[PDB]
Amino acid sequence: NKCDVVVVGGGISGMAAAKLLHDSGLNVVVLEARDRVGGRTYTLRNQKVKYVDLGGSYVGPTQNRILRLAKELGLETYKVNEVERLIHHVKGKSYPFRGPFPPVWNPITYLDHNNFWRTMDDMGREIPSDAPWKAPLAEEWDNMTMKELLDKLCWTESAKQLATLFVNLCVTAETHEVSALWFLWYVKQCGGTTRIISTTNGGQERKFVGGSGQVSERIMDLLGDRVKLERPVIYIDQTRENVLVETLNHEMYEAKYVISAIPPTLGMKIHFNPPLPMMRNQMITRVPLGSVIKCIVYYKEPFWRKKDYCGTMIIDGEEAPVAYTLDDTKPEGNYAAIMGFILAHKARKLARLTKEERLKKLCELYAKVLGSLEALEPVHYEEKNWCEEQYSGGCYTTYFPPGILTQYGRVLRQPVDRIYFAGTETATHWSGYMEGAVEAGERAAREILHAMGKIPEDEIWQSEPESVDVPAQPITTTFLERHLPSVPGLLRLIGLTTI
Amino acid sequence: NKCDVVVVGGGISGMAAAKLLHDSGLNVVVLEARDRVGGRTYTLRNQKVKYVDLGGSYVGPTQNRILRLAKELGLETYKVNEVERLIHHVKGKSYPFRGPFPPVWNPITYLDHNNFWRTMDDMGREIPSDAPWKAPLAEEWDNMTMKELLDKLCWTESAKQLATLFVNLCVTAETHEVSALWFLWYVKQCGGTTRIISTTNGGQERKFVGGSGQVSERIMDLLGDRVKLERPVIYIDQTRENVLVETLNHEMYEAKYVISAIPPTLGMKIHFNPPLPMMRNQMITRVPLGSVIKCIVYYKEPFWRKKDYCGTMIIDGEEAPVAYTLDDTKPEGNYAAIMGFILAHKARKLARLTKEERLKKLCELYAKVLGSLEALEPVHYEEKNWCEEQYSGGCYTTYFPPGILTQYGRVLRQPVDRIYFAGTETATHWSGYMEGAVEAGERAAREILHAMGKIPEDEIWQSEPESVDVPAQPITTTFLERHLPSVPGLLRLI
Ligand SMILES: *[C]C1=C([C])[C]=C2C(=[C]1)N([C][C]([O])[C]([O])[C]([O])[C]OP([O])(=O)OP([O])(=O)O[C][C]1O[C](N3[C]=NC4=C3N=[C]N=C4[N])[C]([O])[C]1[O])C1=NC(=O)[N]C(=O)C1=N2C#C[C][N][C]1[C][C]C2=C1[C]=[C][C]=[C]2
Ligand SMILES: *[C]C1=C([C])[C]=C2C(=[C]1)N([C][C]([O])[C]([O])[C]([O])[C]OP([O])(=O)OP([O])(=O)O[C][C]1O[C](N3[C]=NC4=C3N=[C]N=C4[N])[C]([O])[C]1[O])C1=NC(=O)[N]C(=O)C1=N2C#C[C][N][C]1[C][C]C2=C1[C]=[C][C]=[C]2
Fold it and tell me: Which residue numbers mark the site Important for catalytic activity (chain B)?
């Protein structure tokens, strides 16, 4: 029944909020809809895989909050395999390469590719992380889809196709589904294009030994009986002195404050008294999550390594069920595996098939790309379709369709009386990730601490010291990369020299 | 507790479904979240206004289902005033005109305007009403916003601005918010551009005497104690032999079947066991409703009529809080009033103001456009901001952002085990309107009747005889309208 703060949702954000508040000496309850904690992270354990992350998994440099929280809980990271060559598969052909990005040899295509990435970052610099709607051209960029932006920016099909794959992979949505402003914000608040797509020195550098699900599990252990599983919140009443929170299984909870640590649209599952203010009421119907099936194919050995392939494949084209893979072999070199995401429309399309049919398509693709018959002999397969999750709504995170961020973005983390808003979607650095969940959870917790008069206002937003275990190399550009012209820039140079 | 069918939602669609099923001899319960029926229709009554529709109000020719249902309930329509001249206000200036559409005098602008409307209808003819995702170019049109389409089609700013107003008014959303495919379907399934925006011979021809809220109210009377007010559904359990439906106030209902007669996204407010199939699970997070405040300013007399103005104003520009008005005077000529919609981003922007501040902005605008100081002396004001409604989500209806209709559209009315889907959003003719609510409610009811073996499959979808009270004149085009070239067409000819 009675406590200081009810936290709705036991994912990383809710658990981090509850832990902070508990550590501060407050009585907290976590109400979790599912029979488990973790939310969009889920570590499956069986004999065949030992352990596997079926949701959120990767961490990297600049993600200092999740790294610190996990370290405190007794967890370790290991490096995702990127020792050998990456593969770029284009027009039914594989091109091995070293370094983070597939080389471009055609000089026009090179200028186009260079300009695209550069422009994405240039545009991002105009977008405040904590207030994207305050960008000078916010409205213009928000009233455009990423598809429209790509059509304007890319003078080659090659750049457009790779840019499209980049969008699909980053936000599990089609270029035509998402606001250009929102997507540009999303990339910028992750530290830019290089940081977001890189394995080495980027978001995909590392995984947790034993799985990411341990983060939420170990906090639950610390909180004891304070975490209530199978308690979906259905009703929040703020008419009285204490907030009343009701669950589906008929239980009633009373608190001074509430943290909502669920995906914004999942707020729809709760009936509010009094009704939510107009802007939030409408906002929560406007913010869908993306579509993804995470698939892991297991092999007897990491055979790709013997061919000097690290396991990273970037695969162009509609036919490919998966567009980006990573080696998912354990740090010990066993339980050899390839991880791939079936993204956006392909998640929708391929969900109609059986598990076995999906496995077959993946193996035949990998056999083609790696040029290896061994890819046709999987020993095991695991997958998770996040689109079917009632209490997630999708994965990895919430996307904003055109026009929504400028009109409703201000509302995202605006408190509603005694309800404060956590969840990775309300973060300002690595929003969408486990890192963002920690930031948002701890910030929401601190908002309540300030409301109670326990901390000053300037302590609500707290900086994080850099991890000593996972140091961040700065993102650099060469002179040529900075100053080489775009395609229209080169054409203008030709038109001017013709005088 | 126990019945044949639980209907979730007591708006027109749910009420029509419940009435049909009740008339067939089944035991029906209606579970309604609010302390009233009607949903997106609401008729306010007080001495100052007598009665006023604050939500859905207008009906017109081809809307035969709502007309028949209302007639059976003892209701009558009257004609919205369009006797005198309409006004097109452009660049701070009023241009009175007769007929449905504002004249265009510049020949290039004329060609551009003509081509736009014609192209909208041409495109719509390729879109099946019952399956828009089956249009030959469905993906292409769905992956584009209406803003993108307008940018391609309109060679003049004049046409683009008017086209924008048209979109805003029809679907309470910005051109950049909505799929081109969805919007083109929306217009086509209302009978085309002429039918959708016309007062005379169109969707705004008539209102119900006494208000549209009477439709749901009178059905509730017919159903007696079967309608349960203040019963928001929170949980539907389909694991057992009978469906279990739980409400917020702790009551449990058991039925053989369920009709969901709420806006698709409001399905999110219900916890499902077993979980919804993947496609619907995601669909209901992808389908927002538009943004609108309906505002009615009352005056001592319908003074605009004396100046040979009917009360219809089409008002261009960002500054104007309202872009289209209609005379809202009662058929008796009293309770003189002007109705306007504050739409899309302007609803969001102007909601921050007080009621009094909004009234002032409306009156000053009307005084400008009508050229009358009398517009500055309102006797009364009523408004309703539908964006604040927990159990509506907005108004008039659900819009589809780019990419959603082709990917998730098939799911809209696909049954989930024993749950069937009503609501105006699932209609194929005047979806979005009271008319569509009747169609969907009665069709959903008939799906259950067929599932029970009570009617054959070909009786699920039923045609409606034309109303004798509100006959439909066919939409015609002139020879020049059909064959005059577009702007690029004329340039190609040069
Ligand atoms: C799903 C997913 C996947 C598949 C993958 C991934 C992901 C995901 N991610 C993301 C994460 O996970 C997130 O962010 C997090 O987790 C979030 O958290 P939060 O905020 O906390 O939330 P959640 O989890 O959801 O929780 C919530 C909770 O609540 C609950 N509920 C609901 N409702 C309710 C409740 N309760 C009570 N009541 C009511 N009503 C639920 O149940 C839950 O529990 C990510 N992340 C990271 O970090 N990392 C990673 O890994 C991940 N992933 C992804 C990835 C991707 N990446 C990409 C980009 C670029 C690139 C890539 C790859 C490769 C290359 C490149
Ligand atoms: C709001 C609005 C406004 C402002 C206006 C208007 C409208 C609206 N409209 C629309 C209508 O109203 C609709 O469609 C209907 O109503 C629908 O119905 P339904 O389907 O049935 O649905 P609702 O109503 O919503 O109902 C539902 C119910 O449910 C319930 N719930 C929820 N949730 C829940 C429940 N329950 C239990 N549980 C749970 N969970 C609720 O509460 C409800 O009750 C329209 N319509 C028509 O027809 N007409 C008209 O008038 C209208 N309006 C509009 C108009 C416009 N127009 C335009 C276009 C073009 C033009 C114009 C104007 C001028 C010129 C031109």
Answer: 154, 363, 380
